[PDB]
Amino acid sequence: QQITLIKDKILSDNYFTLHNITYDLTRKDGEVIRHKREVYDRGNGATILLYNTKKKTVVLIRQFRVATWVNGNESGQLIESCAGLLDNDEPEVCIRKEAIEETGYEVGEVRKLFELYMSPGGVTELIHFFIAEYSDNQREDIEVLELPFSQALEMIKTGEIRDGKTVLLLNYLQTSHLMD
Amino acid sequence: QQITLIKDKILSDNYFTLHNITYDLTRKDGEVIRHKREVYDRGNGATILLYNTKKKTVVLIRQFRVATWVNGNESGQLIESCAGLLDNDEPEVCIRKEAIEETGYEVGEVRKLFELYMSPGGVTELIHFFIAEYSDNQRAEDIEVLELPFSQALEMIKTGEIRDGKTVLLLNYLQTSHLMD
């Protein structure tokens, strides 16, 4: 009872849900004041980085993202790590369909790194992170990119790769030395 | 890679604006296919990781977050790096204020790491990342200020006590820079 839900108002329920939540929370002091916060909920998702130890490469994808297009990304094209919304599936089950559907690779074993909130300010979104190696034996609107891991790290510096989850995954592979 | 904006319908304009954008994009075969997508625009922001090579520590903050509380976070409490919305300000200007306001530390020189979309699937949000080493000399409620050893912060990522995207990204970056080695 340290935090109390006063009312969850639905501002929009088109496809995803935008809420206006009113709540009361205590303090280290002893008072209980209420706030009102707009909260957008598009469900949780999963993303995975595909890497190859043989040729020191990674598989990423490129696609048009309107949300970046109307906010600084001229062509709208964004290079990201394969990902998708859970849509009622378990994280791993979902990430396997996504890998197959977006990259064409039917991956084998995968490792779960963590689950992080990507924009806890006004978005509920929690993403499940995975990594997994791929092989050429596992192989329209989405362009599949295969490139050496070192070029992808540099692309973070040049700004060619400017997607949060993707940078997270890449810098993670870097400090794992699985490519070294 | 032809793309044409067809219409921009406002679904909500309470605090931040939620749009339903309809667009036409031409394919590799020449076919024009249209899509409709929700875009939540809450403005861009900036975040900063305050570190100290002297005592090998980092400064972070902790506060309640409704967005996570209604989505798996029992207490709603979240440990994150200092941050805030640009609100018409320049990244470096906004972030300097934030550090002072949220942590009480007035930082000197700051380095910009990069600009990243945190949830490009349906949010416009772009976050500017900064790192800056603090001093106990530069110090001048709803948010708890946490000063803890770097090695612990890093361990807290593995225990899941720290599960915020921008925070984990800044911690790992610091780890790779060798600025604490």
Describe the 3D structure.
2 copies of one chain form a homodimer. Chain A is α+β, with helices and mostly antiparallel strands. Chain A has one domain (1-180): Nucleoside Triphosphate Pyrophosphohydrolase. Helix content of chain A is 21%, strand content 41%. In chain A, a hairpin with a 4-residue loop joins strand 1 and strand 2. At the A-B interface, strand 1, strand 2, strand 3, helix 1 and strand 6 of A face strand 1, strand 2, strand 3, helix 1 and strand 8 of B. It is classed as hydrolase.
Largest sheet of chain A: 7 strands, mixed
Order of helices and strands of chain A: EEEEEHEEHEEEHH
Our count of helices of chain A gives 4
End-to-end CA span of chain A: 50 Å
Quaternary organisation? homodimer
Beta-strand percentage range of chain A: 35-45%
> For the record, what CATH class of chain A applies?
Alpha Beta
Estimated radius of gyration of chain A: 19 Å
User: What is the percent of helical residues of chain A?
Assistant: 10-25%
Shape assignment of chain A: elongated
Number of DSSP E strands of chain A: 10
Largest interface, by Cβ-Cβ below 8 angstroms: which chains and how many residues each?
A-B, 71 and 70 residues
CATH topology of chain A: Nucleoside Triphosphate Pyrophosphohydrolase
Give the domain tally of chain A.
Answer: 1
CATH-level-4 superfamily name of chain A: Nucleoside Triphosphate Pyrophosphohydrolase
Structural class of chain A: alpha+beta
